[PDB]
């Protein structure tokens, strides 16, 4: 865990659905299988700083077979075979960087270096199922996180894509930051608006309208 | 779309009458020869509305019908009255025994006659 | 020569409590014969449509009325 | 239910919490009769007490819409398709059940029973009659006795009339009332009928249901 | 108009939305009778100040009938009737206060001296006729008010009571103010939880968790 990260997130424990978290989920560890470890939920608190967060990528669900994710949203281990959506996102972006080159696997370990939070929402479920598990406290838990970050952290980015992060995170104000939302990555959104929209200029452009640390897609 | 006319605008003609009662809150005059317009703008503009050969059974209003001449320009103006010319309609006639005092209200209800 | 009776029956001078002493009435009722799903959504309908200005207040008290006796009417027991 | 009061004061001079439907008594007005399920109960507009309330568990038909009634002579009640001497409060005779809904009215001859399409007899019990136009039809006669008319509570209710003949049960006329017919009385002195009638199509959000005045015997 | 509420809303005007509304709308009131105005949509920014606002209650439409409102939400003027959903919050405030007092008239000039903040979101709607605008510009300009009390002024509340006070002002925070909803005041609103609550003490007893400026209910 990385401790620079709780320089003021000390104000994360002392709230009555916290223990309702890291006891249940440990509980729901010392009967089932939920799938990614204590090991593999501290990533995106360990890889990245808190210091050069310009994007805000969420995510909704974790990935329920064995030996498949590593905690980092829409993320995939690199023996795996990669994901649709992901490989979905990836259509825009030759359509938009020239210089398009190919990742060939799953692990989303070149991007991560670059300002993207690439955060679940609820960050484990549990083997082989979805979506078995109740409110246990791994929402407001980055609800206290997101919100937070309009506060200390600046220069962020919105691609809330789908219904469930728009409700997360839409009224962080729009002269501090950009936010711009359209239909789902994964190509079972029938209603239309992410096949062919070039949103994935606007990491490299919108940082323009701010002036900080840049980007480049092509780290894979 | 703007279109205009050729002529003199008749809607400004109209609009500045539009600035003298509305301005007319009590201001303590008589609008018995300016109101006269608002039975000589529209014959003026009932002058030129027979240049088409008009089919008589119109009951409705021009502004509904035939938006290619002024008289439709300017009944949908002066009909959208905010229920402040309707006023008038309750004061020239609640407090009217001068013929002056109905000269403003005589005249005009017949100046909406197809509004009425 | 039929002379009307004089209305010297239950009067409702009220109405702004009237309604109130019966409109959670016509709730009350409704409920107990039909599920909540349209009863939610046509008041949200007339509330779109009319809102707290008293013309869908007794409106749902003529749509609420009107569907209870008719419902009472076509030959279901409850529904 | 309530009987109210026409003469000039307009009050409740009776009140009931109970029945479905109240009916008179026929000839000699003093008697209220108003049923609640399959349970009648015959009241008096003196007292408002209840006189006498008839039923038998062991013979009851359970019908839908169950409407008791009196004979003209005043004597006779069809509670549940069930006769009713109302003289010593018993039973006569369980009529046999087909229709699901209607447990049955009266002719005013006296002499039968006009079940919801089998006409039945007051002294034999023997099936006259079955007139298949009767299909679940509310019944009104005349003053007289000499016509019924029909009105369908078939989902829309009354595409038209039903005219019937008191005598031989013969059809007369249906006319076409194109909206839905929903109630139906008449006059005294034969001269207009009293029909409500709905606007619009067969709508449950939105009934415009006026009354319609004919005239009897005007093309 | 209150020049200290524009203390720093001058970052109200350079949107492209903002004389898409006071223009539209001013030509909606040189044909129509948009029925609140001029002279009254000012009224919330004049009468009370933004020194003293602890309660943030918002207000959906306007009352399309002549010689009715006067820019307060849930408000009207005081020889109208009062109306309904106002009559059945006071059902509530007498089972709270002990020593219930009556208003007897609609005018709401009793409780905006207090801290609360009645805002309708759309200020303005047409005579007669109560949903007929489009998004005008009322919202957004209402929207850069309310989560921007969220930076300066403090010791608000969120009684937002209703599906359409839920999507405006949900996000803000937990440690710093409280949220608490419930159903609509309205009777129209077949799923309860109106029907009795004691929400009406929370203005009382939630500025105990702050310690500013007092309330008391009874001015009427």
Chains 1, 5 share one sequence.
């Not at chain 2, 300016?34 to 009951?59: A, C, N, V, W």
């Not at chain 4, 006189?51 to 008791?68: E, H, I, M, S, V």
């Not at chain 4, 249906?174 to 139906?184: A, C, H, Q």
Request: glycine residues 6%; proline residues 5%.
């Amino acid at each position: 865990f990385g401790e620079s990260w709780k320089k003021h997130l000390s104000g994360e424990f002392g709230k009555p659905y916290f223990i309702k978290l890291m006891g249940f989920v440990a509980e729901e560890r010392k009967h089932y299988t939920v799938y990614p470890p204590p090991h593999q939920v501290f990533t995106w608190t360990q890889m990245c700083d808190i210091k050069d967060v310009k994007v805000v990528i969420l995510g909704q669900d974790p990935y329920h077979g064995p030996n498949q994710a590593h905690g980092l949203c829409f993320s995939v281990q690199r023996p795996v075979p990669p994901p649709p959506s992901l490989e979905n996102i990836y259509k825009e972006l030759s359509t938009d960087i020239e210089d398009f080159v190919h990742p060939g696997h799953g692990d989303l370990s070149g991007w991560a270096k670059q300002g993207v939070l690439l955060l679940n929402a609820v960050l484990t479920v549990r083997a082989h199922q979805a979506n078995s598990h109740k409110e246990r406290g791994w929402e407001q838990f980055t609800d206290a996180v997101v919100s937070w970050l309009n506060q200390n952290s600046n220069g962020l980015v919105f691609l809330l894509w789908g219904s469930y992060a728009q409700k997360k995170g839409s009224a962080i104000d729009r002269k501090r930051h950009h936010v711009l939302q359209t239909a789902h990555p994964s190509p079972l959104s029938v209603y239309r608006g992410f096949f062919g929209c070039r949103h994935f200029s606007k990491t490299n452009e919108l940082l323009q309208k701010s002036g900080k640390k840049p980007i480049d897609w092509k780290e894979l | 779309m703007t279109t205009v006319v050729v002529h003199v605008d008749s809607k400004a003609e109209l609009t500045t009458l539009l600035e003298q009662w509305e301005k007319e809150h009590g201001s303590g005059q008589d609008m018995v020869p300016i109101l006269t317009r608002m039975s000589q703008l529209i014959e003026k503009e009932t002058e030129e509305y027979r240049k088409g050969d008009p089919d008589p059974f119109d009951d409705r209003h021009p502004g509904r019908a035939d938006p290619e001449c002024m008289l439709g320009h300017l009944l949908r103006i002066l009909f959208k009255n905010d229920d402040f010319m309707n006023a008038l309609v309750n004061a020239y006639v609640m407090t009217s025994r001068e013929p002056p005092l109905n000269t403003a209200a005589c005249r005009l209800l017949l100046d909406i006659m197809p509004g009425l | 020569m039929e002379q009307a009776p004089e209305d010297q029956g239950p009067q409702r001078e009220p109405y702004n409590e009237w309604t109130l002493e019966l409109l959670e009435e016509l709730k009350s009722e409704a409920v107990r014969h039909f599920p909540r799903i349209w009863l939610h959504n046509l008041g949200q309908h007339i509330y779109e449509t009319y809102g707290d200005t008293w013309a869908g207040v007794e409106a749902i008290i003529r749509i609420l009325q009107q569907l209870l006796f008719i419902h009472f009417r076509i030959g279901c027991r409850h529904s | 239910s309530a009987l109210w009061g026409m003469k000039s004061v307009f009050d409740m001079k009776h009140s009931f919490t109970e029945d479905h439907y109240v009916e008179f008594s026929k000839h000699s007005q003093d008697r209220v009769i108003g049923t609640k399920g399959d349970i009648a109960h015959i009241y008096d507009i003196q007292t408002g007490n209840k006189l006498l309330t008839l039923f038998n568990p062991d013979l009851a038909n359970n019908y839908k819409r169950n409407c008791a009634t009196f004979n003209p002579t005043d004597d006779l009640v069809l509670n549940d398709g069930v006769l009713w001497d109302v003289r010593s409060a018993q039973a006569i005779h369980k009529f046999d059940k087909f229709n699901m809904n209607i447990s049955g009215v009266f002719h005013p001859n006296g002499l039968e029973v006009i079940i919801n399409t089998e006409i039945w007899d007051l002294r034999t019990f023997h099936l006259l009659h079955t007139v298949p136009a009767l299909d679940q039809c509310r019944v009104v006669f005349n003053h007289t006795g000499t016509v019924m008319y029909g009105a369908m509570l078939q989902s829309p209710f009354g595409s038209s009339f039903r005219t019937f003949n008191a005598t031989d049960y013969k059809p007369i006329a249906t006319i076409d009332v194109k909206r839905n017919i929903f109630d139906l009385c008449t006059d005294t002195k034969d001269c207009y009928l009293a029909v409500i009638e709905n606007q619009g199509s067969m709508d449950a959000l939105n009934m415009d249901t006026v009354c319609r005045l004919y005239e009897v015997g005007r093309q």
